[PDB]
From a paper:
Myostatin (growth/differentiation factor 8 (GDF8); gene name MSTN, gene ID 2260) is a member of the transforming growth factor β (TGF-β)3 superfamily of signaling proteins that is primarily expressed in skeletal muscle, with low-level expression reported in adipose and cardiac tissues. Myostatin functions as a negative regulator of skeletal muscle growth, and its overexpression results in a substantial decrease in skeletal muscle mass. Like other members of TGF-β superfamily, myostatin is expressed as an inactive precursor, characterized by the presence of an N-terminal signal peptide and a prodomain that holds the growth factor in an inactive conformation. Subsequent proteolytic cleavage within the prodomain by a member of the BMP1/tolloid family of metalloproteases activates the latent myostatin complex, destabilizing the prodomain–growth factor interface and releasing the growth factor.
29H4-16 is a high-affinity variant of the parental 29H4 antibody and contains four amino acids changes within the complementarity-determining regions (CDRs) of both the light and heavy chains. For crystallographic constructs, mutations in the tolloid (D99A) and furin (R263A and R266A) protease cleavage sites were introduced to generate an uncleavable precursor protein, pro-myostatin. The structure was completed after successive rounds of manual building and refinement using Refmac5 (49) to a final resolution of 2.79 Å with Rwork and Rfree values of 22% and 26%, respectively, and belongs to space group P212121. In the observed crystal form, pro-myostatin exists as a homodimer that sits on the crystallographic two-fold axis so that the asymmetric unit contains one pro-myostatin monomer and one Fab, whereas the entire complex maintained a 2:2 (pro-myostatin monomer:Fab) binding stoichiometry. Overall, 29H4-16 Fab binds to the arm region in the prodomain, with one Fab occupying each arm region of the pro-myostatin homodimer. The binding interface of pro-myostatin and 29H4-16 involves two CDRs from the heavy chain (CDRH1 and CDRH3) and one CDR from the light chain (CDRL2) of the 29H4-16 Fab and the arm region within the prodomain of pro-myostatin spanning the β4, β5, and β7 strands. The hydrophobic patch is composed of pro-myostatin residues Phe170, Leu174, Tyr186, and Leu230 and CDRH3 residues Leu101, Val102, Phe104, Leu105, Tyr106, and Trp107. Additionally, Asp114 from CDRH3 and Asp51 from CDRL2 form salt bridges with residues Arg190 and Lys193 in the β5 strand of pro-myostatin. The nonlinear distribution of the contact residues in pro-myostatin shows that 29H4-16 binds a conformational epitope.
Author numbering:
A (entry chain B): 42 to 95, 109 to 124, 136 to 260, 270 to 310, 339 to 375
B (entry chain h): 2 to 226
C (entry chain l): 3 to 212
D (entry chain A): 42 to 95, 107 to 124, 136 to 262, 269 to 310, 338 to 375
E (entry chain L): 1 to 214
F (entry chain H): 2 to 227
Write the structure that this text describes.
């Protein structure tokens, strides 16, 4: 009856542990709901990912959003090479609504180390945009090749400057100094494509893979033409974690010989469950 | 939002001309400004750019040393002063404004979305001269039993443009006036042709009215057979 | 200079691509801008910073930049798109540079042959001691021809001036060629001829002193 | 220790049962070794397959090739095969032409039988060949019959068998069906390649069965105070109750904060139990 | 007589893969096996393919062929320059006759594709006074050697009166040909113009003459 | 393995000819046999087939009622009898053997892998006749680039070899003499054109010298501009 209910709490604690292990996280992240509210961006790529809802073991990362470290924006990511696998990289910025129709000039500059000539900056995108009152807009800037150079050589990234201004030079900032602005900060959207046997006589480390050969000729199952034998193996909860198929050529006893692929016939790896 | 150009013309080689471009509808001193030109039937050629206040000027090698760009932010006006004019300087000159304001870096790198209407300058040793007007009479060997082309040849005039109408403007059907051609003499020539029904020849009168304002010359000629 | 193919064409609804090759000093380091120019109007900026459109420009106009080259691609090709198209960029030697222009033809109607009329020197002009042969070429599509003059079946290059074609009231192209002779020359050949070629089909007309 | 050895024979009995179930056979076929010898064809496609050894369905076996020998003048072929004419990638009739004693040209004709008509009675024509043979060697011939076999599936009762003729220039018959004592694996057969046939217990928390089955379990991250996970808030993980554990699992996608100023979207494998079934 | 249709011409580069097409009727190709022949200049044909896709002995597998519906294809991979020849399709028609297609000249390109120049002479005064009238369209120096010729009286096509030579190799190894249009003098007087149109690799060259005479 | 043909020739319309095809190398009576022909520069046309033993014969509509196929299996020989010959029957006639033997069904459906060397038959109601010669004057219809085509049109002659030289052979450069065309009348016509510089017209005189030996006719004609 309800013996399972007691065990149910410990199954949930086990899944928690397994989730952290599949992620690659030593501890559960400590983030307040308030801080989540501040950092979660209210932008198209996140509304796309959220709106959908409403190495065998490890998790595979498809997309990474990096917020600014800590001042116009610096991005720090320990993201591990993968220029080659970095499929796309976009800087997302939100331009706040304006009061009157105004044309807004945006320039986004990569910093480089100051020299005599070409002091301070390089240039990534410059925009001229016409805004009407009441609505702000999100802009997505391709920075794939830029971001790759940063990963290839850290210390070549000093961050970026973003300027936004009207025809006369007055500033109208993209940087929001208030509690009421939530999810409105800039962010970087990067898409990437990341990817115990024993002897028959061995006294095991409990869970282990043990050899087992199935000989159809031995059972007088002569209808199977090929394989005559195969290595199935077994585990000694200690259970198979990974299996492979075999192909079989056999008589079905209906005047037909069939050649077929039989899934999950061979145990390749076992693990504890 | 507008750029209204002024001050072209014809001028002798080695002599000089000054173009104007007046801006309205935007803050003139928030933009870099350019001049670009185009020779009769050729491509665009950038000639120069100037910074917001006039402190930097860059020029195409082809006009380097002979043309000078400048501006008067108080009169909202862009200038180009052309000296040592050659015949290959003949072209339509357009003024254009940068798409981005000078408060961004490299604003002049990015392009020009504004543009004036253009100003023609023609560099030639020719003097002003009215055209000779010759009939292009229909002959008996017409294209069709029904229809013949007739017209009139407008020869040896300077400078462009000349204007042709037929029967004081009461004939806009079947009428093509070709572009001029420019001769080794430096004089322009052109033809205007009107395709008519061949039955009407012998009675209905066809008159080309030529007008060359630059020489104050009007000619009216009847074409007959 | 930046290099662009001299020509391009499409059918209404087709997708054309205009190309621009340049140097590391210009396109390779610097933003590319593209212009449209209709006959006898100023240029109009279509694209800047490689792939951005100014206000008022349909997204069927898109453009990109790889290395030392750029591309302007017009999807959903309308017949208003008939125009010259130019790339541009700033070179690091301090000058703005345009490409040479690409004529884009929007195939909008059937191949019409030119009619051709050749008028001889008029009485009036000969009596003025001059002589001009006028070859008028009318209502042909597409707008491209070549003209050749023959005196007594021998070619003549001296004295020839030819107009480039020009769209008319009925939307078919027209053109003109002039041959300038002395009256002596005009008297001393049995005939003169104007030979016009339009998509491989050739028309000729002849006039003779009379 | 070797507790295992005692269990070893019963693991083999379990795999036997599972093999029959994956092949969709209620019982192991009873075929004598003698009959196997008679029927197994000694032909290229089988030498290839044998010599190689030296609501979607992932459980059941998938048929790649079907070899049909004739039902007991010869060669009618019998099909409980279910339609799938579009899926039939290839169909070849294999026949063995016996050795000749002089160099001779051999003319082969394969005819589809049709319902008799007054004119052109009972034969349609499928392939005709001419081959040159030298003494001492017989040869296997593969004849494309894909369009024919498709008509048979499309309309059964349009399959009235086939006739096979093989003869020399002067008409002498060189039979293709081998009834000799020595002659094994030399009969005709049909090789059809197909791409087709793409195609446990779950319980209430309080339901009484102790047969091992799937039980619902909903994981609510908000309940644990794991607010770092943006999406899914919740999901059905499930569980199971010589071991009753999950035989098939699926992944989920998860959008979460890693606590390093990054939000990650990833695919996490084996999060949901789909089937439990003893193993 | 129910004939099979094959493109008049084909070409490939040595090593390239050409395809020769054959369109028929359900009476022939649709129900019946197709055979293909190769013919070199002034030799008998040689069977390349039978029963749609089968090669007789001595025929390379680069020659393959197929049949779908009412059409068939001969495809020559690995194109050698001995393959320069005429290729014919064939099948038995149900009306009880074997039917060939019209033949496809296959060119194995050993030079660049040259367009024909065209010279169109009108009837001479002399011939008209003899009560005849011949328009002579001469076609010179084109590669590969295959064209079609089309005559227009004013702007209307005219099939009546046309005789057209087959091409032939010249001194410089470019092909040449001729088309004659025979008119009465009355017919020649009646139209404002006559025109000779030759087509070579999709591109068309055209000339015109008129009773207006120098 | 061979088919060796015999017969053929020239003949007047309404007359008759018999072609022979002798087979060796194979058992002749195991096979259907065909005749196929080809008119000068046109496609292949199948004319008839005959069964192994002679009992069925099918013919193309174009020869139906006038040609007859037959065979004598004892002399290993295939025959075609051609009667009421017309000019459009002129062609090379090839005999061919079926690739498949008659012990299969539809053997004649499948094609023919044997083939003889061919036999020419030429059917004309034309008598010997010399050519009419017309000038093709150089017009403003030159070939451009300072060069003009002029020539002469050699009309209505029989039989085929006619020969054209320019200025007694002193001008061989720029000359193309085209193949003849053969008319529904059965007379041949041809053009010979010489590409010259257009500057030379009006001084250098051009003469085509036409020779038709089969009628003993020589023509010399000056071509002048108009």
């Amino acid at each position: 009856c309800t013996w399972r209910q007691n065990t149910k709490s410990s199954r949930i604690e086990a899944i928690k542990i397994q989730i952290l292990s599949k992620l690659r996280l030593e501890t559960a992240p400590n983030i307040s709901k308030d801080v989540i509210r501040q950092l979660l961006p209210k932008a198209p790529p996140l509304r796309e990912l959220i709106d959908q809802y409403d190495d065998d073991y490890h998790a595979t990362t498809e997309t990474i959003i990096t917020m600014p470290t800590e001042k116009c924006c610096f991005f720090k990511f320990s993201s591990k090479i993968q220029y080659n696998k970095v499929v796309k990289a976009q800087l997302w910025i939100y331009l706040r609504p304006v009061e009157t129709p105004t044309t807004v000039f945006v320039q986004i500059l990569r910093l480089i180390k100051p020299m005599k000539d070409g002091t301070r900056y390089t240039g990534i995108r410059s925009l001229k945009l016409d805004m009407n009152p009441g609505t702000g807009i999100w802009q997505s800037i391709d920075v794939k090749t830029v971001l790759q150079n940063w990963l290839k050589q850290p210390e070549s990234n000093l961050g970026i400057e973003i300027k936004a201004l009207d025809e006369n030079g007055h500033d109208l900032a993209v940087t929001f100094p208030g509690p009421g602005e939530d999810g409105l900060n800039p962010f970087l959207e990067v898409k990437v494509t990341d990817t115990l046997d024993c002897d028959e006589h061995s006294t095991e480390s409990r869970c282990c893979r043990y050899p087992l050969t199935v000989d159809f000729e031995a059972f007088g199952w002569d209808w199977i033409i090929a394989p005559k034998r195969y290595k199935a193996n077994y585990c000694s909860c200690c259970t198979p974690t990974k299996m492979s198929p075999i192909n079989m050529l056999y008589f079905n006893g209906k005047e037909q010989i069939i050649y077929g692929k039989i899934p999950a016939m061979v145990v390749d790896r076992c693990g504890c469950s | 939002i507008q750029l209204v150009q002024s001050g072209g013309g014809v001028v002798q080689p080695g002599r000089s001309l000054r173009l104007s471009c007046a801006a309205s509808g935007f803050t003139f001193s928030s933009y870099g400004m350019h001049w670009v030109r185009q020779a009769p039937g050729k491509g665009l050629e950038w000639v120069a750019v100037i910074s917001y206040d006039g402190s930097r000027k860059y020029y195409a090698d082809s006009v380097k040393g002979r043309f000078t760009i400048s501006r008067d932010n108080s009169k909202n006006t862009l200038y180009l002063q052309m000296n040592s004019l050659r015949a290959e300087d003949t072209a339509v000159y357009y003024c254009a404004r940068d798409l981005l304001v000078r408060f961004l870096y490299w604003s002049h790198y990015y392009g020009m979305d504004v543009w004036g209407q253009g100003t023609t300058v023609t560099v030639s040793s020719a003097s002003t001269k009215g055209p000779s007007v010759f009939p292009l009479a229909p002959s008996s060997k017409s294209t069709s039993g029904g229809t013949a082309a007739l017209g009139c040849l407008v020869k040896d005039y300077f400078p462009e443009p000349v204007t042709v109408s037929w029967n004081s403007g009461a004939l806009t059907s079947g009428v093509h006036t070709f572009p001029a051609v420019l001769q080794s003499s430096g004089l322009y020539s052109l033809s205007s042709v009107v395709t008519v029904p061949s039955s009407s020849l012998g009675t209905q009168t066809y008159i080309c009215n030529v007008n060359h304002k630059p020489s104050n010359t009007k000619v009216d000629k009847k074409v007959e057979p | 200079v930046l290099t662009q193919p001299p020509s391009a064409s499409g059918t209404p609804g087709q997708r054309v691509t205009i190309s621009c090759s340049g140097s590391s000093s210009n396109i390779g380091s610097n933003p590319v801008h593209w212009y449209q120019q209709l006959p006898g109007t100023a240029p109009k900026l279509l694209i800047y910073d490689d792939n951005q459109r100014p206000s008022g420009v349909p997204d069927r106009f898109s453009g990109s930049k790889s290395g030392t080259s750029a591309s302007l691609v017009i999807s959903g090709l309308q017949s208003d798109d008939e125009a010259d198209y130019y790339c541009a960029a700033w070179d690091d030697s301090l000058n703005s540079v345009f490409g040479g222009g690409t004529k884009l033809t929007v195939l909008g109607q059937p191949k019409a042959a030119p009619s051709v009329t050749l008028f001889p020197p008029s009485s009036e002009e000969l009596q003025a001691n001059k002589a001009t042969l006028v070859c008028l070429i009318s209502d042909f599509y597409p707008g491209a021809v070549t003209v050749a003059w023959k005196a007594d079946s021998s070619p003549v290059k001296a004295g020839v001036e030819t107009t480039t074609p020009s769209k008319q009231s009925n939307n078919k192209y027209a053109a003109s060629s002039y041959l300038s002779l002395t009256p002596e020359q005009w008297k001393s050949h049995r005939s003169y001829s104007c030979q016009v070629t339009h998509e491989g089909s050739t028309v000729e007309k002849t006039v003779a002193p009379t």
